[PDB]
Amino acid sequence: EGYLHVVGPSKVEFSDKKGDVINNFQGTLPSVPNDWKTIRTNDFKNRKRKNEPVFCCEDDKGNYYTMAKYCETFFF
RNA sequence: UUGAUGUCACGGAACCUUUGUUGUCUUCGACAUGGGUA
């Protein structure tokens, strides 16, 4: 028994130009959601081992975002 | 709200002294963010 410490999906890499993760997404990038609770990761940095999930997306003025946090912390 | 045979109040400049002044280069590089793996 304990408490959940929920900070939000705040570990983000962002750029004006397309890096290695974005280049290899294989799809149409999603748009940035409005609600922080609906975000879900959509591929991996190490896609062989399936470690390190990320959420890749694009905004309407041309920035690219890679959110690389998927866990949240439990204090007990 | 006067009192009566007695009021110069047009009998008295709100006057006199005091510095919006003292100090300050239109300059300039390393910093943001929080996890991930066993």
Helices of type H across A5-65: 20-23
For residue A56, count other CB atoms closer than 10 A to its CB: 20
User: What is the number of other CB atoms lying within 10 angstroms of the CB of residue A57?
Assistant: 19
**A23 sits within 7 Å of strand B by its CB:** no
- Distance CA(A72)–CA(A39), nearest Å, equals 13
Under DSSP, the state recorded for A39 is: -
Protein-covered nucleotides on strand B (Cβ within 7 A): 33-38
Experimental method: cryo-EM
Resolution in A: 2.5
Strand B at less than 7 A from CB of A10: yes
Please tell me whether any atom of strand B lies within 7 Å of the Cβ of A6: no
